[PDB]
Amino acid sequence: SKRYFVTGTDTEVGKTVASCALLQAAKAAGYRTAGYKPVASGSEKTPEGLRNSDALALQRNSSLQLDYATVNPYTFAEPTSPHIISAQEGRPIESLVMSAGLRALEQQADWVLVEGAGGWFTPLSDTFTFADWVTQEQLPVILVVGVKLGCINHAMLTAQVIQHAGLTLAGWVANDVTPPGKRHAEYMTTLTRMIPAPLLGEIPWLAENPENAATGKYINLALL
Amino acid sequence: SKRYFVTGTDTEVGKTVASCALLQAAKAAGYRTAGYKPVASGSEKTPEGLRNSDALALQRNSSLQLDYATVNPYTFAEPTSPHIISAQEGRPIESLVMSAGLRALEQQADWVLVEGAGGWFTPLSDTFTFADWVTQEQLPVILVVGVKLGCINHAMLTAQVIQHAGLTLAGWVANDVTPPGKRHAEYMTTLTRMIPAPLLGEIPWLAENPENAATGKYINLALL
Ligand SMILES: Nc1ncnc2c1ncn2[C@@H]1O[C@H](COP(=O)(O)OP(=O)(O)CP(=O)(O)O)[C@@H](O)[C@H]1O
Ligand SMILES: Nc1ncnc2c1ncn2[C@@H]1O[C@H](COP(=O)(O)OP(=O)(O)CP(=O)(O)O)[C@@H](O)[C@H]1O
Ligand SMILES: C[C@H](N)[C@H](N)CCCCCC(=O)O
Ligand SMILES: C[C@H](N)[C@H](N)CCCCCC(=O)O
Ligand SMILES: [Mn+2]
Ligand SMILES: [Mn+2]
């Protein structure tokens, strides 16, 4: 299966919006797709247990019908760092459970997108970070950049750390988190020049519900 | 002279507030202090030319009476990346002018604090970043961390890049940019454990005008 990990320059830059776009483009290319969100914090109560909105978006944008727990094995109610709430609850986040889940998806899908939690270095326990599991799995990484002041520094910091870990930075996606501002074009030229990976496409600012929008058209899967 | 460069986990995390605290603690220890902001964007018009608020704060918290241009040689009106507005204006930001300015302060001060612009990787031209000048000057770096969700990842990214450049990370300052929230203590324990440099102190959330507040007491200069 092709496999990709999606990370962002910060929490709340549109990582689930860009993952849905990527999943829609892959389905359009003919792949049997599956989204995977191994760890999620910030969840609603339902009759079936906790459900996280990001994981629900990944589940409904996959071309296979998948069960919720297959998409998101670890679900925590409080929107904080996974390692704080895990210790609070007495539910260790296990690397073998995260990896087994990825293998299970690979039995049925041939294009799998894995979304992390927060940014690159999100702690999963006191001695283990998300970055450690991605390095362990040798996943190529797609960086989502919310275009806003401060994003050049965050995109370059994340790009260098990934490359120093010996991982492939597969490409980056520009996500317009605000309406058209004055230095949009110059910001896009600097980011193109400085991130050592192809620009896969730019998702425009979409006021109402962008994760349900049809955004696959903004992604050129040909560069991945 | 002792010399330190102050950087932040992002733009707007309280870097000028923590620089004023640091300058007030150094003056209290008996040092002849000078703040230096070589490059500033986001400036007001006055009868004397453009003046930047950060640079004004550094100038009024120094124990020597210094002229504005000595504190801030490059002043741009638009609050954007220095390299965009520099090219726009036809005013190159020169590394020799930035370094000469630091030497000039060193003729009169024995404790000099240098504040950068934005975060670590802020571009100054199309082939030169702020990080390149700090490496060139071999300045030890103090990291200011605004305590908010997403800050563990940004503090670790910045800490690793500085150390990979062979620079000393002298310490870090925790700045409380919001009122007391639910996971404050756990966030402070994780950041202490993960940043390989002493915690110099924590500045509390101060609603009204914190750069004019007397905040020197929150800094332990003894660890620098
Ligand atoms: N293209 C766009 N236009 C308008 N709003 C957007 C947008 N992209 C993202 N947003 C909005 O910004 C917020 C964050 O989006 P998203 O959930 O995709 O980011 P993220 O995955 O980085 C969050 P987390 O760190 O919890 O995973 C949402 O409210 C979303 O609808
Ligand atoms: N301890 C604190 N309590 C309340 N507000 C604070 C604060 N620290 C910073 N702020 C506020 O946050 C904003 C940013 O502060 P500051 O100017 O020191 O940050 P900064 O230097 O990172 C900005 P720039 O990137 O332009 O240099 C200001 O409005 C400031 O008063
Ligand atoms: C204007 C702002 N307040 C600071 N002076 C400069 C921030 C530059 C950020 C560059 C970037 O990383 O995107
Ligand atoms: C709750 C939030 N929306 C994401 N699920 C997780 C963000 C973890 C951030 C950890 C940190 O770097 O401070
Ligand atoms: Mn998300
Ligand atoms: Mn400042």
UniProtKB/Swiss-Prot annotation, chains A, B:
Q: NCBIfam families recorded for this chain?
A: bioD (TIGR00347)
Provide the residue positions that the database annotates as binding substrate: S41, Y187
The molecular function GO annotations come to: ATP binding; dethiobiotin synthase activity; magnesium ion binding; protein homodimerization activity
Subunit field text: Homodimer.
Keywords assigned by UniProt?
A: ATP-binding, Biotin biosynthesis, Cytoplasm, Ligase, Magnesium, Metal-binding, Nucleotide-binding
Q: Does the keyword Nucleotide-binding apply?
A: yes
- Write down how the cofactor binds this protein: Binds 1 Mg(2+) per subunit, in one structure a second Mg(2+) was seen.
Reactions catalysed, semicolon-separated, are: (7R,8S)-7,8-diammoniononanoate + CO2 + ATP = (4R,5S)-dethiobiotin + ADP + phosphate + 3 H(+)
Name the record gives this protein: ATP-dependent dethiobiotin synthetase BioD 1
Q: Does the keyword Cell membrane apply?
A: no
Q: Which residues form the signal peptide?
A: none
Kindly list the positions annotated as binding Mg(2+) 1. Answer: E12
Native species of this protein? Answer: Escherichia coli (strain K12)
